Write a protein that binds this ligand. Structure first.
Ligand SMILES: *P(=O)(O)OCC(C)(C)[C@@H](O)C(=O)NCCC(=O)NCCSC(=O)CCCCCCCCCCC
Ligand SMILES: C#CC[C@H](NCc1c(COP(=O)(O)O)cnc(C)c1O)C(=O)O
Ligand SMILES: O=C(O)CN(CCN(CC(=O)O)CC(=O)O)CC(=O)O
Lengths: 74, 84, 126, 400
């Protein structure tokens, strides 16, 4: 399932899959800092063989935003 | 004045993306790990002058990584047993 | 160890094991010394017509020692006791393409054959 | 086909990419002879040489004037041992070293014995560490030099260099240490340790092969008779064209090691503990050679009873390892280092060396451990010594 987005986010952020909810902000809800979110964006790029440029990466601040970006880029 | 934070997060991304192109396993895995460890270790520095020194070193090292990635692609070799 | 022929006797082991020392039809040669880094145990099983019908080995040693004794164990099978007596270190070394610094391995393997064959002959005298 | 893991950093290291990057300008456009005094190819080559000299000096706490470039630690050891002995030969004829030194120290001392010098080769304890009070007792009135290496290349044991320097300083005996395996890996300060001469190798610290240095203390002035005659380069101590790219590489490796030393030591310590503890909890009769309390974690020497070390290296076909030594008499004739610490001869035939370094990964360690466990078990099942001990035979009772 493209919600493999949840697996990456939990892996990257060290949070049980239970806590990785569609509503959550990486920083406010899951304890990420901006070094984590750089790496998290890169892990999504690697996982889905997709290129996420800065203006798009800047908008990907929540679990759903990551799910929606990946779904809309094949 | 340039933003140290903008510079720092953009160097972080560039340095990680470029290091991932190292053809050789031991340089690639070292560079990615070392960059991650060094930015994290220096996350709480507050002196604007020391930060700028760290940024300048990171820019120097990004040049090193770019040049050495390309040289290691010109003279690449087989992968290690464990990349299988 | 580097030669394909030598490494093959470790990667594709054959005849590793033991025979029953108490058998009148089993001869056991144990040659070498732990302090010299090379100890070979070679056992032969001889049928009543004097044909060696089975053999087993164990070796503590570098790859060429393992290969020399493994080869020796293959080679004694199907030979009579008198035939196996003529296997030479130089045959083992040529077959494995041993370098000069490992020629001592093939000499110990020939010692192991003759030790095993002599223990067997000792047992037949009564 | 696929390449083996490199776990052999005591034999040599890969170049750090930062070091190759610093060297390459001098391999391409800055190719001048640093002794060419009349033009800019010479001037820029000389300036790079002198910057590299300061980088080496800064790592060890020296003045750059005390740094002499050489072709490697072998040459530096020859200069320190033969050069000191020959300089004071008319007054002093006795030298002291240890039985576990590298062959270039031992062979240098042997050649001086053929020259009429007296050499004491000190024993070491079973830990691999010298006995300081035996060193003290060995110093004679005509003792010109003590030489004791900082980290042993086969078993990784650390000699008490600062305490040795205290002994030698207080008796006005020159103290040399072969630091080839320690420079850039543990802290070295020539003044706190009271070192008079020190050997350095570029390719033990992610720098290029073919280059080294010797530290020669200038206050109090240590006197050395030069071995390489020639045009007087390196203050008359080492004639020959200074090879700019190599010395640039050596200085870059020293500066990188100065920055990275603490981070590397923490990472290698963790990987080293993991390798040792996971092998030992999965295999019986595994012994570490050398005292773990006084030990550089990146050099791990273990014996695996009932298995011969070269067959284990063959079995570990996708890991580059060694049985120690000058890449020579390691398992061929048994290690003289293992013999000097009292290892049984058969167990010295059963020992192998693992090296963990700056670029080693946790996955490489785990792969090596897993394969070592599998193949030690396999080789034991092929071993007549294991079969005998399993049948309850005492091997010390057989007539071999
Ligand atoms: P985010 O959580 O909003 O912010 C993250 C940062 C770090 C930007 C934030 O915490 C901050 O601004 N901190 C202030 C201090 C600071 O900027 N620290 C970072 C300075 S730059 C740095 O540390 C780079 C170190 C470079 C090491 C490279 C290693 C190269 C190896 C290559 C070898 C082949
Ligand atoms: C080199 C190598 C192998 C290593 N020991 C060698 C080394 C040397 C020799 O230095 P160079 O001449 O620059 O090569 C001198 N002293 C010490 C302590 C070491 O380690 C090994 O494989 O054991
Ligand atoms: O980022 C890293 O740690 C390095 N590598 C992982 C190293 N790989 C080897 C490979 O990619 O062939 C791991 C492995 O296969 O062991 C990432 C990448 O491929 O870009």
């Amino acid at each position: 399932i493209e919600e493999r987005v949840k697996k990456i986010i939990g892996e990257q952020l060290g949070v049980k899959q239970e806590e990785v909810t569609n509503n959550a902000s990486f920083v406010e809800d899951l304890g990420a800092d901006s070094l984590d979110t750089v790496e998290l964006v890169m892990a999504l790029e690697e996982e889905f063989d997709t290129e996420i440029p800065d203006e798009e990466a800047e908008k990907i601040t929540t679990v759903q935003a990551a799910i929606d970006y990946i779904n809309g880029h094949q | 004045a340039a933003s140290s934070r903008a510079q720092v997060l953009a160097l972080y991304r560039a340095m990680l993306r470029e290091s991932k192109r190292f053809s050789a396993y031991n340089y690639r895995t070292y560079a990615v790990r070392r960059i991650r460890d060094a930015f994290r270790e220096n996350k709480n520095v507050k002196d604007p002058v020391e930060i700028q020194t760290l940024v300048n070193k990171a820019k120097r090292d990004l040049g090193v990584i770019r040049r050495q990635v390309h040289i290691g692609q010109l003279y690449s070799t087989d992968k290690l047993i464990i990349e299988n | 160890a580097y030669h394909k022929k030598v490494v093959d006797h470790y990667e594709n082991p054959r005849n590793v094991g033991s025979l029953d020392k108490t058998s009148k039809n089993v001869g056991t040669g144990l040659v070498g010394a732990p302090a010299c880094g090379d100890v070979m145990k070679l056992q032969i099983q001889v049928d009543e017509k004097g044909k060696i019908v089975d053999a087993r080995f164990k070796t503590f040693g570098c790859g060429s020692a393992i290969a020399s004794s493994s080869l020796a164990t293959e080679w004694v099978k199907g030979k009579t006791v008198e035939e196996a007596l003529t296997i030479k270190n130089t045959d083992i070394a040529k077959e494995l393409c041993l370098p000069p610094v490992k020629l001592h391995c093939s000499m110990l393997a020939e010692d192991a054959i003759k030790a095993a064959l002599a223990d067997y002959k000792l047992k037949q005298e009564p | 086909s696929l390449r083996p893991l490199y776990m052999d950093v005591q034999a040599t290291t890969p170049l750090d990419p930062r070091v190759l990057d610093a060297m390459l300008p001098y391999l391409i456009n800055y190719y001048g002879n640093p002794h060419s005094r009349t033009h800019a190819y010479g001037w820029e080559s000389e300036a790079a040489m002198e910057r590299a000299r300061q980088q080496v000096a800064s790592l060890i706490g020296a003045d750059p004037r005390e740094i002499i470039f050489t072709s490697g630690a072998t040459e530096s050891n020859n200069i320190a041992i033969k050069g000191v002995a020959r300089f004071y030969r008319s007054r002093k004829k006795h030298l002291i070293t240890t039985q576990t030194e590298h062959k270039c120290v031992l062979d240098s001392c042997r050649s001086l014995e053929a020259e009429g010098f007296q050499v004491t080769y000190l024993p070491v304890q079973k830990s691999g560490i010298i006995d300081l009070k035996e060193l003290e007792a060995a110093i004679q009135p005509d003792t010109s030099l003590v030489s004791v290496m900082t980290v042993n290349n086969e078993i990784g044991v650390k000699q008490p260099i600062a305490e040795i320097g205290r002994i030698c300083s207080s008796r006005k005996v020159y103290f040399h240490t072969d630091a080839a395996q320690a420079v850039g890996k543990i802290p070295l300060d020539v003044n706190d340790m009271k070192i008079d001469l020190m050997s350095i190798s570029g390719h033990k610290i992610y720098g290029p092969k073919g280059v080294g240095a010797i530290y020669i203390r200038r206050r109090p002035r240590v006197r050395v008779e030069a071995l390489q005659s020639g045009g007087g380069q390196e203050r008359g101590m080492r004639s020959g064209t200074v090879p700019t790219p190599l010395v640039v590489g050596l200085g870059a490796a020293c500066e990188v090691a100065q920055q990275e030393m603490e981070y590397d030591h923490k990472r290698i310590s963790k990987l080293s503990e993991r390798l040792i503890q996971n092998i030992m909890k999965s295999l019986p009769d595994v012994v570490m050679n050398g005292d773990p309390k006084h030990h550089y974690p990146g050099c791990i020497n273990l014996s695996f009873a009932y298995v011969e070390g070269e067959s284990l290296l063959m079995a570990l076909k996708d890991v580059a390892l060694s049985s120690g030594s000058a890449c020579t008499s390691a398992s061929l004739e048994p290690s003289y280092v293992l013999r000097a610490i009292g290892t049984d001869e058969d167990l010295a035939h059963s020992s192998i060396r693992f090296g963990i370094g700056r670029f080693t990964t946790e996955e490489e360690v785990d792969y090596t451990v897993e394969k070592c466990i599998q193949h030690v078990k396999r080789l034991r099942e092929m071993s007549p010594l294991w079969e005998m001990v399993q049948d309850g035979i005492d091997l010390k009772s057989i007539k071999w």
